[model samples]
Target chain A: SDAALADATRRELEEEMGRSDKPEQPTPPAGWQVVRKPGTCTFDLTKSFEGEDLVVRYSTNQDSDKANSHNIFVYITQKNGQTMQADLSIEEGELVLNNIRFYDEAALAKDTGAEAEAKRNELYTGPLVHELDYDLLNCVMTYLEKRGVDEKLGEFVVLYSFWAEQQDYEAWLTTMNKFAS
Target chain B: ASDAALADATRRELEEEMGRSDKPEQPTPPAGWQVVRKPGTCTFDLTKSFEGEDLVVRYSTNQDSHNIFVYITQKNGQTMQADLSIEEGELVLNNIRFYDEAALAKDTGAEAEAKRNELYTGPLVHELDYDLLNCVMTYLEKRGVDEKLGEFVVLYSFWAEQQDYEAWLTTMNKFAS
Candidate 1:
């Protein structure tokens, strides 16, 4: 299964972006591993790529029908001992992250039934938390855009989705507060 | 008493019990006892209990000409009752469930026929497609490799080839079929 994940990720990268210099093809650049946990699998790509650490986590459940609701969180630890966090709540069926603050505000205003339900289901299924590289990069891009930070300075950290049947306002607020601190 | 009155009574009973009106061409009962005719309205009763059980009816009928009544009970303690008056000429057979031996048989036959059609249309015909044949071929090709010397390698290549063939067959069948 770990081999399958490595092979699949390599194939996906090669097919999508025509990057064939994958770790499995050659001796991976040091700390490369496909980590497997209950209901989730991840490919840690920090050693191969430069800049901040990157992790790609994937999970799936067959019995789940909650198809459209999920949230993506990016946690970044800056070089100066500071941290930045960004949250993106995917609308019911759409996957694009348009406005971070707008989503944050909307989430805080009141519970968006559709979005909250999707996030909740994602959390309920196994693998309570996962660190994803692709999502981390995506979220970093969002954060940089908001802070007027340059894309050239974009660095990956960790990405994960906290799914729930309803909005866990307390948990989200606490995470945000920690990021602010 | 007249035949028309008896037929009307039976129609009322059929409608009451089945929650539907009897067919216009109702069957007549055999020659028999004198039937008295009377006019009465029909309604529903949900509170009635039978054999220590609560009764519910969703349909009822009144056979005024035959002096007979029919009703159906629903699970929710509701009853539909039909009242009928008797007529002497001939009793009309309106409620088939009460007399016809083959009343529900047609429905059962149709259900079975539908199920058979679904089975044939689903898996039976599906097997005739080229996909199944290609799968068999791919399986055979994988089995041809020497198992003793190259168990793992042969099995791996066999599985890979099978997958490739499966994908190829899916595409080919999409176009050919």
Candidate 2:
């Protein structure tokens, strides 16, 4: 077994890749379109609603291998160029907000260096979601839910991650197999 | 800062947990590779000179996560980062990106960072046409970062994770005591 470990590993991977129960691509809810390039883990779900441009970012392998959850960043850019970002985690099928940041207009553009860092620092001084009152956070959740980022969207994201991760894994094996041969 | 009392309680509990556990061992590096382990963090670097280039591969795992991040760097500073998973009985590359140090440290703003990513990463590896992918793969093999090395990393990662978990438990027990 030790002598032919490499060959054994290859065959085992080949069999696993041959599984018939691979996950299918998920359909984005109405008004939202997903942007993902081939062989990448991160993906963006984009939609424009009532003059605000929204992007929800997620990566399939982003959650540490030890963690039982996944995370996403929701960026909502207003017509005024300012953006509000919510950092959320999905635990036991529910979305939990951890942090929210309101970025200045300059931070969304070519602004760089010390001044931009200062602005970000100021924003970071704001309270975390857990530090805020329950009523306020509840309203924020409602705000997000109305914009198509409810538990249903979270469910879609979980499925999408599984699909994307499997697809990337198969492609990686294919590339490695060709190279190995 | 606002939760000083809460912080104190948390620290007390953490310290108690720290006093409970024992010890662990380090994983072996691949043949001919020099390994440097970071004492306080879950990270390590393996370096070996291939041809004229000094290749360094960094491996790290989050304290609470089951994934390992592998960063492979060329002498010129071009790097390919890969996220790996081992739960499926074999090593699986879940995600990968190519970036340079300049692109990585270019800016902090989200929009600027996005632009830098587009400029630097160029395109996803699988987006390349088959011929290009083969050529690129051959180039990597020539530098000694081939299928064999990937297999070694996988085998090593499984061992590393086991040791790391043992160490983690020791630390946890230490804190609990």
Candidate 3:
């Protein structure tokens, strides 16, 4: 089941990232199920996202913090063929959900924060963590889509986080030097 | 005249090798380049004539051997390429202007010959004759005229004509013994 999940997750990741070459997969932890949905595939780490484990279910997209204008876009489709969109920004190391509007604009002012939280919750239910290099980190997700390597399909966020940490350290050094002066 | 012969031979060789009969078109002469035609100056004494001046014409072919120190001069305008073969000890006449005949015809018999004889001394005639021959052969081969040819000639001719001298006698004795 783990292998099957990994294979499915890898396939989805390949499709989403548009990467022709797949990197060798690392050994996964026990009890992980790779699930495939309509437009997404995920490695499910938990038995379910509902009930006691609901709060911990959150998704993450990691990229270097040294990027210019790093932002995230979320699209949600309803059963009625209607779609909602939201723009997310990073501030103080947290995702801030904003700019929500429906296709009709009159449909409803839905609680964007709650909706984003739910999406984040679904993301955390999976074992996958999306990681990216700094120079490539802040590049538009669509570019990654063209390249077929997106954060949602599978996870490898540690690479991006490491780069972010490096940038943060450099910035701190500059700030300290300025203060000393 | 030696210059003229060497030039003629050089031109013929070029024509044969390059397969062109027409006078080769000259390249643009470099700045300050000058075409000089100096007659070979010779003084000679004849048995009948006292003294004479041989005005030998010289021309430069502007070629050099592998070492740049030796310059080549060729005879002007004569196509006898065999003249190029004349190196030292060989001589060819490319052009001649005999003043002896003209001067003789202008004067009475013995008087002209006496005056010429007065000019053509053994030493003078020998030197000029040797140079004329040397220059002709020089023109025949790839023209290589040593810049020191004049000095070498003076010393050689001086020593050669004085075979009775003590230095000559000693050198000859050493060779024979």
Candidate 4:
């Protein structure tokens, strides 16, 4: 039984290695500096605009969703140390903002236990994009756009994610192969 | 009415006896294991060495929805990844497989892709009545991939996410300013 399993595993590993050739890496949009390490899934994009800097954090991996759809947490940090946490969905190759909330840095840092839970509950209960007043939602979307967090940025993330995730897979296959032998 | 009342009291008494009313505690790692997290990522790995081999359980809640993906590696000349679920404050091993590293090492392309699809796209773990699946749990537990390790993952994820978030903000602050 072990022998059979081992044989099946060997065949699969060989086939996987054949298909694991690295994909072409994509270039980030102008002014965006990519920060990622080899063999890891998460990365950041940092850029400067008129005396302020913006950093957007993303991970190539995500929870599986409906066809051509995936959700991602977009952590956009501003120069003033306040970060707007946005939950965005990539649907049919487009980025759609679902919700936005400001990180409660002080509350998270200062409190623990029941109080921390209370604060978290309060912070995440912010209205979704559709539930927000029309003007407020417009301003929030424009705010992110002004910082270069728009459709093009989302497309770049998708392209880069494919390449980065492939590298991680290849590395994993190599490790898996070594262990099997 | 009498039966319902009796049942209610029995449930309440059992709940108290089982410590169900207390606030749930976070799981802690068993002694001597090290929790390693890579910077700029939401994932972390729990690692330890037992009996001349190394054990590492890689996990990240961010990688899946409500479910935590666990890759348990006990380097006893071979390795397997285990999927687990936390039910009623205990770890349940759901599925596992011993992969062939040599096959994955071969080459890349459509054949490999097809092979991978074939390997996993077969019957779901719950569908198959494979006996080894039952025995492998003990094999893994003996190698230290036990419930304590699962608890360690739960607690560490809770603690580490906050730490990582702070670190991430600090990095952004340093870079931005």
Candidate 5:
């Protein structure tokens, strides 16, 4: 589960400036559900009936001080059971409907080996359905925003709304852009 | 109900992280209470006794309403009164609290070297997720160890469920970006 999340988020940034011709000043998706997971490499549009959910999970480690850590989960499963559910995402800087498949759980566990025995846990297991990717705001995303989920996406629309704004997409970038040149 | 959404997310996340182990554990119910879920369904029952207020709760997340809802009825031979005794799963959010930077900053340390009694809170929520009881079922199913229940730890806060996130994201963010 951790690795799925890690891979999903890392592959997001580990991509090229990609789509070098994309929106220099990208528009926000309808809402957080349809937009790409924050830190995504490129922007892609998507929407869902149930919609994607972006959550910030925090907790008390209770184990010791400095235990408080923030966890982000960008869940983008908008499809039903085994239907031909399709989604768009920025992959390696390219806009794409990420297609993944489910493999045998045993085969998955085998590839993992003894070390992965108890350590690996996820929503679904089978060496991955395929690639796990997150997207930036795109078309279907507008449908998602209309449905309403997280408020930050709303801020994303207003703050990063116009190309004229030139807002940095980073936490630090925003600090400077919000004030100085 | 201001904190209801916050409570739901915490419960969902608690179920997520806590499920990382095969020999996983669950919280202990106070007394005369059991949170039994019907296998293969998103439904669970709350069988409780609150100071002679015996009651049963039936919950459904599959009613086509797209929202999780529950209905309560007094079990036969007893008339359920005001709710007090609650199922452990229901109590999950009840023990959680979200504290801000200003608040935690004020609850300063007695000293750096001293032992602590409890801890406090943060922007928190859960994903489109699964039931907590099901989390336990899968945990026990894999490990086959029913006796390790005593070692499992649960999140507990006397006033977590009542926290109001209908408040501010300003306070939600910890600090020092």
Candidate 6:
């Protein structure tokens, strides 16, 4: 009876704590700084180094007043026009990211022939394509893994860069596991 | 989060974002045969490897973005990847790899002369003053000019003739910059 009582008491406390309304901020990796953007529910980890600027950000997703999903959200603008946003969350053992969309740019180039094809390639493959390539992962995985990103588990990395003129961008996954898995 | 915070952060962000001096210059490949090196200078490597080819683009100076400019060359690297796009009134060119024809072709002893044709459309295209549409003030209502089109890196490659090029009419509005 005492054991049952203790179990019941613990459950009640957990429920009460989960009902709170405060938003919690996650800790960022070292040497990086976090800043909240204006008029948005996002936190960006940005810093200048490596001959250029780099960042990793997350948007808090409210599951409830005090609860948030296990996801990392970030927004980035392509050097050209498109703006890309993503919700990276840990689903199962896989560190998956989805709900990605492109905005602030045309779906695809209105140009015809080879020009259109080049533009189409840009839309379909370019945006996050380089980030997913071997050369990039060579460094990305090294950096992320060094931080012990996921114990080689969230190793699962998924990315999608939607097409402007038509469908969403191609979807791919690696373990950070495989290439960008 | 608040208006003041926005202003302060925005101010600091701009200064920091644009704060870097050109670091280590990108590696420059010797000008390819026939292709005059009209290289657009940039210091960053998109691959993060800090290594890549500096291809020379040959074209006439002061030639505004007009006329049908075309270039055809076999890619130098074992793999060449670039996200070529024209939107927000600019170009986002990235993941460009340029390797030597001899190394890529796995030959130096044979056909050294013919191999040079890899990146054809010689000297003339290297110097066009026309607008390459590198970058601009994107962002709909409130916009700002992005310094260069290379978010990740610079890229150069194939082109079809405009006579039939437009007949086939490939993408991009080449002028008015």
Q: lDDT per model, in order?
A: 0.29, 0.60, 0.30, 0.56, 0.29, 0.32
Task: Residues A74-165, candidate 2: write the lDDT tens digits.
Answer: 88776667666778988889999987655546244223355555335423222334755454466567678878888888988988988877
Candidate 2 vs candidate 6: the TM-score winner is 2
* Worst ten in a row by lDDT for model 1 chain A: A120-129
The prediction achieving the highest lDDT against the true structure is 2
| Residues B18-119, model 4: lDDT tens digits | 564443344566776787655434556677777765566666533221233344333434545566775654667676555555233122234554565566
TM-score of chain B of 3: 0.18
TM per prediction: 0.17, 0.46, 0.16, 0.42, 0.21, 0.24
- TM-score (0 to 1) of chain B, per candidate? 0.16, 0.55, 0.18, 0.56, 0.23, 0.18
Model 4 agreement with the true structure over A18-111: per-residue lDDT tens digits: 7755567888898989886455566768877665445666778744655345455555544455555667777666777786555535234223
TM-score of chain A of each: 0.26, 0.81, 0.25, 0.72, 0.22, 0.36
Off by over 4 Å in 3: A1-68, A104-181, B1-177
User: CAPRI verdict on model 2?
Assistant: incorrect
**Across residues B21-137, which tens digit of lDDT does each residue of candidate 3 receive?**
542332332222232322211111111111221211122221111111111212332112121112353333333222323333223234454564555222322346776666654
A105, model 1: CA deviation in Å? 25
DockQ, all models: 0.01, 0.02, 0.00, 0.01, 0.01, 0.02
**Which DockQ-derived CAPRI band holds candidate 3?**
incorrect
What's the true lDDT of residue B175 in model 4?
Answer: 31
Candidate 4 stretches greater than 4 Å from native: A1-22, A37-39, A62-69, A76-80, A104-124, B1-177
TM-score of chain B of 2: 0.55
When candidate 6 is compared with the true two-chain complex, its DockQ is: 0.02
Write the residue-wise lDDT of candidate 1 on B115-168 in tens digits: 434532222322455686456334322322112212222223333333333332
Candidate whose TM-score is highest:
2
> Of the true interface contacts, what fraction does each candidate have?
0.00, 0.00, 0.00, 0.00, 0.00, 0.00
Off by more than 4 A, model 1: A1-34, A37-51, A56-58, A62-65, A89-95, A98-181, B1-177
Query: How well docked is model 5, in DockQ terms?
Result: 0.01
Return the lDDT, model 3, position B53.
18
As for TM-score, the candidate ahead, 1 or 3, is: 1
